[PDB]
Design a protein around this ligand. Structure first.
Ligand SMILES: COCCO[C@H]1CC[C@H](Nc2cc(=O)n(C)c3ccc(-c4cnn([C@@H]5O[C@H](COP(=O)(O)OP(=O)(O)OC[C@H]6O[C@@H](n7cnc8c(N)ncnc87)[C@H](O)[C@@H]6O)[C@@H](O)[C@H]5O)c4)cc23)CC1
Length: 241
């Protein structure tokens, strides 16, 4: 008998890839000289190997979180939801805004899938639990839930979030931003959450800050005692310049 999940299995060469990304990150960032990439890999593998892939906890990732500290300035955070490429293109142009992918852990795990099995050290290259179809507490989803919660908790001053105005649901309360990040912004550190609704499609222009999902985000943020601000980015290329 072999247990089979609905999701794709661990990315081929996952151990080598994580180790190589750790080494590349330390070679490009001077503030990472004290980081031992072999220890980072051992902490990462230790979070999920030998464990049932549907019973992973935020606590399983604590050793990895201790090795992969966050150093980005809290007043320069850009969150985003379903507009990844434009958000990262904007940060490369501003050079004074950072996303979760700018951190060691965000950079290590991006676009990778991984899981193990109970009692053995074997990484499952055949299949991994799908968050929706199999189980929410899988190694990948738990990792992103933990790292995005820490990223949001650290934020301060004005936090910006880029949203895709051409989507049917502009703010989706089920996304990582909607279900994790918004709920961990601290009012004693964060004065305002400012949404930038990008009009990056050919849709008929309209004030998208009036969309029902934006009113829902405003309500969530207001109940946390944080100010909400929303801006329409009617001309994204002009906003970049
Ligand atoms: C309270 O419990 C109940 C809720 O549970 C949480 C729900 C979220 C879940 N997130 C992910 C699950 C997981 O399996 N994978 C593999 C993840 C891969 C990466 C990240 C990711 C990276 N950056 N971020 C920070 O969050 C904001 C951006 O995320 P979003 O707003 O989600 O934007 P989206 O453009 O839609 O997605 C970003 C990517 O993630 C995938 N993803 C998203 N949601 C899921 C999901 N439920 N199941 C499977 N995959 C999911 C999606 O396919 C895309 O590749 C930014 O501000 C960043 O700082 C999060 C997240 C996930 C964790 C569990």
């Amino acid at each position: 008998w072999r247990q089979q999940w609905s999701g794709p299995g661990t990315t081929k060469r996952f151990p080598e890839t994580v180790l190589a990304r750790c080494v590349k990150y330390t070679e490009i960032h001077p503030e990472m000289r004290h980081v031992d990439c072999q220890s980072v890999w051992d902490a990462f593998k230790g979070a999920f190997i030998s464990k049932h892939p549907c019973d992973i906890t935020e606590e399983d990732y604590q050793p990895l979180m201790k090795l992969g500290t966050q150093t980005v300035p809290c007043n320069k955070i850009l969150l985003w939801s379903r507009i990844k490429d434009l958000a990262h293109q904007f940060t490369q142009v501003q050079r004074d805004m950072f996303t979760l992918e700018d951190t060691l852990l965000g950079y290590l795990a991006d676009d990778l899938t991984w899981c193990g099995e109970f009692a053995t050290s074997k990484i499952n290259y055949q299949s991994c639990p799908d968050w929706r179809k199999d189980c929410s507490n899988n190694p990948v989803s738990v990792f992103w839930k933990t790292v995005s919660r820490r990223f949001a908790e650290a934020a301060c001053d004005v936090v910006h979030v880029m949203l895709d105005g051409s989507r049917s649901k502009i703010f989706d309360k089920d996304s990582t931003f909607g279900s994790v990040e918004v709920h961990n912004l601290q009012p004693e550190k964060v004065q305002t959450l400012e949404a930038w609704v990008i009009h990056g499609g050919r849709e008929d222009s309209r004030d998208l800050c009036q969309d029902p999902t934006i009113k829902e985000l405003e309500s969530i943020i207001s109940k946390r005692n944080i100010q909400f601000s929303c801006k329409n980015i009617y001309r994204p290329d002009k906003f970049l310049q």
